[PDB]
Amino acid sequence: AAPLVLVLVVAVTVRAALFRSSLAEFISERVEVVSPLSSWKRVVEGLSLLDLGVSPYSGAVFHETPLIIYLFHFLIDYAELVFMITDALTAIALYFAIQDFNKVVFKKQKLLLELDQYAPDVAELIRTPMEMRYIPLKVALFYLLNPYTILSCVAKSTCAINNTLIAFFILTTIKGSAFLSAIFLALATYQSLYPLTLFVPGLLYLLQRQYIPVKMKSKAFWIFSWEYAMMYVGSLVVIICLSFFLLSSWDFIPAVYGFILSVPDLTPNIGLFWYFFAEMFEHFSLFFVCVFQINVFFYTIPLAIKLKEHPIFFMFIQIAVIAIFKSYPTVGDVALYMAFFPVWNHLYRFLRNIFVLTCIIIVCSLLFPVLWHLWIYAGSANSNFFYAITLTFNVGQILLISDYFYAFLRREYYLTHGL
Amino acid sequence: LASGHLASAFVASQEAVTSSELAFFDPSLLHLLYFPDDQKFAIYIPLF
Amino acid sequence: AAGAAATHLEVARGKRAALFFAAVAIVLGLPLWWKTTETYRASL
Amino acid sequence: TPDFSMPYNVICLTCTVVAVCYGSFYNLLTRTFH
Numbered sequence: 001a002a003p004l005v006l007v008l009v010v011a012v013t014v015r016a017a018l019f020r021s022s023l024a025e026f027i028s029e030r031v032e033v034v035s036p037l038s039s040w041k042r043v044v045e046g047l048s049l050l051d052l053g054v055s056p057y058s059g060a061v062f063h064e065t066p067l068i069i070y071l072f073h074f075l076i077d078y079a080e081l082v083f084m085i086t087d088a089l090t091a092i093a094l095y096f097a098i099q100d101f102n103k104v105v106f107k108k109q110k111l112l113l114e115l116d117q118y119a120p121d122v123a124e125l126i127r128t129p130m131e132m133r134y135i136p137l138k139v140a141l142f143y144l145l146n147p148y149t150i151l152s153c154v155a156k157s158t159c160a161i162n163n164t165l166i167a168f169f170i171l172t173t174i175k176g177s178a179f180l181s182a183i184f185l186a187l188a189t190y191q192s193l194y195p196l197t198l199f200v201p202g203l204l205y206l207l208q209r210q211y212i213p214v215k216m217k218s219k220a221f222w223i224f225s226w227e228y229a230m231m232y233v234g235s236l237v238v239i240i241c242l243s244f245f246l247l248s249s250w251d252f253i254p255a256v257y258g259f260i261l262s263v264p265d266l267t268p269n270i271g272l273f274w275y276f277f278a279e280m281f282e283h284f285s286l287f288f289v290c291v292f293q294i295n296v297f298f299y300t301i302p303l304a305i306k307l308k309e310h311p312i313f314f315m316f317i318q319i320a321v322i323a324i325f326k327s328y329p330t331v332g333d334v335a336l337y338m339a340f341f342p343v344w345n346h347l348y349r350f351l352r353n354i355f356v357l358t359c360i361i362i363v364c365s366l367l368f369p370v371l372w373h374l375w376i377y378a379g380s381a382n383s384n385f386f387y388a389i390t391l392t393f394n395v396g397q398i399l400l401i402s403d404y405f406y407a408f409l410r411r412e413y414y415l416t417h418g419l
Numbered sequence: 420l421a422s423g424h425l426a427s428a429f430v431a432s433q434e435a436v437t438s439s440e441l442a443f444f445d446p447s448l449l450h451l452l453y454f455p456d457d458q459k460f461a462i463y464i465p466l467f
Numbered sequence: 468a469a470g471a472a473a474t475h476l477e478v479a480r481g482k483r484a485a486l487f488f489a490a491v492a493i494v495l496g497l498p499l500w501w502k503t504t505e506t507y508r509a510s511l
Numbered sequence: 512t513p514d515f516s517m518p519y520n521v522i523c524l525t526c527t528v529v530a531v532c533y534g535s536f537y538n539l540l541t542r543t544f545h
């Protein structure tokens with residue numbers, strides 16, 4: 001109780017201290033922290049264009065949804081308070097979700113014990129109440145005190161609101177409400193397109209909570225799936241139709257979703273698209289954009305075949321994949337799946353090459369600003385340095401995720417067959 | 420021309436020459452605008 | 468009798484995943500590459 | 512400005528990274544412990 005309040009106080013104090021210093025303007029302009037879809041300056045530009053009588057979507061600078069326009073129209077003066085509130089909200093939601101999940105896990109593990117479906121000598125692999133006591137508080141601390149999250153907050157990037165919506169989706173799903181879950185997933189899909197892939201894991205968790213078997217010759221399964229899908233799609237339809245009536249146009253749609261899907265702007269970031277499409281042969285551009293945006297939606301089905309009985313680990317992997325392979329990535333997207341590492345640290349004995357990967361990620365994080373400076377202000381370097389750093393960062397992320405997946409499977413094998 | 424109607428034949432021949440030369444000199448028939456078919460394997464090998 | 472069931476299930480699931488991989492690979496990669504990288508010629 | 516000399520190395524490197532991810536996931540999702 002007191003630990004959570006103390007953590008919140010420390011996080012708010014650090015953010016408030018950094019808001020008043022001489023580094024806020026420097027932080028607000030980093031290409032690693034803001035994107036053409038997240039910058040605060042584009043928000044104020046759109047609001048000014050509306051007061052000059054021009055449509056915000058008639059140019060090439062503003063790519064935000066109308067709901068952001070409404071919110072910040074009413075709260076432009078109190079901007080710095082909003083982001084603190086949102087970060088606290090996502091931390092608290094994660095805390096309570098993890099508490100409930102741990103209860104389910106211990107109860108499920110306890111039930112198997114008497115059905116004696118575990119090997120005779122498998123102990124020291126059994127979860128105990130003394131070790132799961134401080135997992136939620138840790139999760140909250142890892143989210144709040146991550147430098148990526150603090151940097152995102154001081155820059156007033158819109159990614160914080162997206163993270164809050166995802167965290168509320170997780171909280172409502174684990175607590176067992178499907179209507180609110182569908183609403184929050186629709187709100188997350190409205191802002192960015194990729195969160196639609198989290199539809200399958202949440203449905204699997206809900207079905208498992210109802211004790212409904214998942215089979216092709218079942219009746220409850222199909223009815224539940226149909227109801228959930230209908231609620232989600234209706235939510236999306238109503239939000240879009242409501243968005244039409246703010247400015248009486250459909251122009252926001254190509255400005256947002258077309259921009260995400262087609263990647264016209266070539267500003268550098270920590271992703272894999274910008275330099276590839278600045279150095280492309282025009283004959284193959286369509287084929288390559290199609291391939292590299294199918295890659296994101298590719299893994300959901302086989303992962304759902306393998307991880308059918310473990311929906312939450314499935315969610316964690318899917319969020320990491322979205323963060324790695326999106327068109328305009330930011331460190332704020334990276335922090336969200338890093339917040340989940342404490343949940344999976346009982347798998348530490350089966351991890352291999354964790355040390356080198358952590359060191360490499362840490363080094364690349366510091367090497368981004370120095371090489372940006374040497375390229376853009378000194379003139380002593382070129383874009384190849386920056387491209388190499390982005391390549392190394394993404395490779396390290398992929399290796400780390402694969403390691404966690406391997407450790408999970410190895411522990412399952414040892415649980416079933418004997419240590 | 421075989422039937423002996425000179426005026427209609429003249430008009431038809433005018434249309435024939437106009438259409439043929441319109442097709443022949445089209446700006447899109449320049450070989451230099453298209454990617455060489457020899458180098459495509461370089462592109463498809465790395466992800467195949 | 469748990470181990471046999473748990474080896475059989477995992478083998479079957481691996482087979483299913485491999486089949487999905489192969490099916491999506493051919494069924495999308497061939498038509499997509501053919502239709503996006505073709506020289507369009509009309510009829511003469 | 513970008514580098515005008517290497518439009519062909521970029522394709523190979525980026526596709527190599529994507530292939531690394533694909534190989535890891537395929538090997539993890541298709542095989543079984545023996």
Ligand SMILES: CCCCCC/C=C\C=C/CCCCCCCC(=O)O[C@H](COC(=O)CCCCCCCCCCCCCCC)COP(=O)(O)O[C@@H]1[C@H](OC(=O)CCCCCCCCCCCCCCC)[C@H](O)[C@@H](O)[C@H](O)[C@H]1O[C@H]1O[C@H](CO)[C@@H](O[C@H]2O[C@H](CO)[C@@H](O)[C@H](O)[C@@H]2OP(=O)(O)OCCN)[C@H](O)[C@H]1N
Binds near residue numbers: 360382389516517524
């Ligand atoms: C750890 C696992 C890593 C996973 C994958 C690895 C990814 C990154 C890691 C290493 C790099 C590999 C990929 C790098 C490729 C591009 C980067 C590059 O090589 O460029 C050089 C950047 O320097 C660095 O890379 C290192 C600096 C810091 C980065 C550190 C690396 C990562 C560290 C992270 C962790 C460290 C510790 C952590 C542990 C705790 C810059 O050099 P430069 O620009 O001078 O040279 C280029 C170019 O050189 C190359 O790119 C090398 C070619 C192959 C490289 C790929 C590596 C192979 C395998 C790597 C193994 C890694 C491990 C993987 C296994 C896990 C190239 O040769 C030339 O083509 C290029 O152009 C050249 O630029 C210059 O050259 C020309 C001549 O000067 C010039 O051309 C112009 O001038 C000519 C006139 O003569 C003209 O003919 C031309 O037309 C041209 O046009 P011009 O008329 O001049 O117009 C001018 C208008 N501006 C170019 O201009 C010139 N720039």
Ligand SMILES: CC(C)CCC[C@@H](C)[C@H]1CC[C@H]2[C@@H]3CC=C4C[C@@H](OC(=O)CCC(=O)O)CC[C@]4(C)[C@H]3CC[C@]12C
Binds near residue numbers: 217218219222
């Ligand atoms: C595969 C494509 C077309 C996507 C859409 C899925 C359909 C194939 C699903 C939707 C509803 C399903 C049906 C829903 C209910 C049943 C009844 C079920 O049998 C019972 O309910 C018997 C009850 C008993 O006697 O215990 C057999 C499968 C079947 C026909 C299902 C077969 C698969 C159906 C048609």
Ligand SMILES: CC(C)CCC[C@@H](C)[C@H]1CC[C@H]2[C@@H]3CC=C4C[C@@H](OC(=O)CCC(=O)O)CC[C@]4(C)[C@H]3CC[C@]12C
Binds near residue numbers: 236237240250
């Ligand atoms: C809820 C989800 C599953 C899809 C259903 C939502 C529909 C209510 C929306 C989504 C996208 C919309 C379309 C997006 C773009 C266009 C192009 C637009 O064409 C223009 O006139 C644009 C430029 C111009 O005004 O000159 C006409 C409306 C239309 C078809 C929109 C009609 C309404 C649509 C189908």
Ligand SMILES: CC(C)CCC[C@@H](C)[C@H]1CC[C@H]2[C@@H]3CC=C4C[C@@H](OC(=O)CCC(=O)O)CC[C@]4(C)[C@H]3CC[C@]12C
Binds near residue numbers: 193233253254258259
């Ligand atoms: C959750 C499921 C059921 C549906 C999710 C919604 C998407 C399927 C829809 C919603 C809005 C749509 C977009 C609305 C407007 C456009 C612009 C339209 O024309 C363009 O300007 C294309 C861009 C370009 O080629 O430059 C092309 C399709 C696209 C991206 C649409 C693609 C499909 C989108 C993303």
Ligand SMILES: CC(C)CCC[C@@H](C)[C@H]1CC[C@H]2[C@@H]3CC=C4C[C@@H](OC(=O)CCC(=O)O)CC[C@]4(C)[C@H]3CC[C@]12C
Binds near residue numbers: 285286289290293294
């Ligand atoms: C579950 C749904 C989202 C379908 C599964 C994902 C893919 C099969 C589809 C869905 C949306 C598609 C994208 C929608 C819009 C575009 C923009 C389109 O851009 C243009 O045509 C403009 C010119 C160019 O840049 O080539 C290129 C293909 C792409 C990325 C599409 C590639 C294939 C995607 C990722």
Ligand SMILES: CC(C)CCC[C@@H](C)[C@H]1CC[C@H]2[C@@H]3CC=C4C[C@@H](O)CC[C@]4(C)[C@H]3CC[C@]12C
Binds near residue numbers: 092175
């Ligand atoms: C009102 C809007 C702006 C923000 C809402 C934040 C607060 C009120 C919400 C967010 C997450 C919520 C918690 C999520 C889960 C649980 C577990 C349940 O067994 C009791 C309620 C409890 C503990 C909720 C209490 C209220 C809560 C703390």
Ligand SMILES: CC(C)CCC[C@@H](C)[C@H]1CC[C@H]2[C@@H]3CC=C4C[C@@H](O)CC[C@]4(C)[C@H]3CC[C@]12C
Binds near residue numbers: 183230234235236
């Ligand atoms: C504008 C922002 C704040 C969203 C507010 C909540 C939105 C998502 C609410 C308002 C009205 C709601 C809809 C009202 C009725 C239905 C019919 C039901 O059979 C499925 C769900 C569906 C389609 C709801 C989906 C969620 C919904 C669209």
Ligand SMILES: CC(C)CCC[C@@H](C)[C@H]1CC[C@H]2[C@@H]3CC=C4C[C@@H](O)CC[C@]4(C)[C@H]3CC[C@]12C
Binds near residue numbers: 286290499503
């Ligand atoms: C149905 C979903 C889930 C999967 C199917 C893949 C869809 C989304 C993808 C795969 C290949 C894609 C097509 C590939 C190339 C072209 C040519 C040009 O006209 C641009 C769009 C268009 C026509 C794409 C439209 C979207 C497309 C059809």
Ligand SMILES: CC(C)CCC[C@@H](C)[C@H]1CC[C@H]2[C@@H]3CC=C4C[C@@H](O)CC[C@]4(C)[C@H]3CC[C@]12C
Binds near residue numbers: 483487490491
């Ligand atoms: C969205 C998804 C469900 C539809 C897209 C097409 C994919 C998923 C379909 C097309 C052909 C299908 C395969 C056809 C036959 C078999 C053999 C059976 O013994 C197990 C399932 C398996 C291996 C199917 C898995 C799913 C599959 C690969």
Ligand SMILES: CC(C)CCC[C@@H](C)[C@H]1CC[C@H]2[C@@H]3CC=C4C[C@@H](O)CC[C@]4(C)[C@H]3CC[C@]12C
Binds near residue numbers: 292295463464495496
């Ligand atoms: C990358 C994933 C996640 C999305 C889509 C994967 C599949 C459909 C794509 C990715 C790379 C593609 C291949 C890339 C290059 C070539 C060489 C060409 O001469 C024939 C088609 C072929 C062999 C493609 C087939 C389809 C392909 C295998």
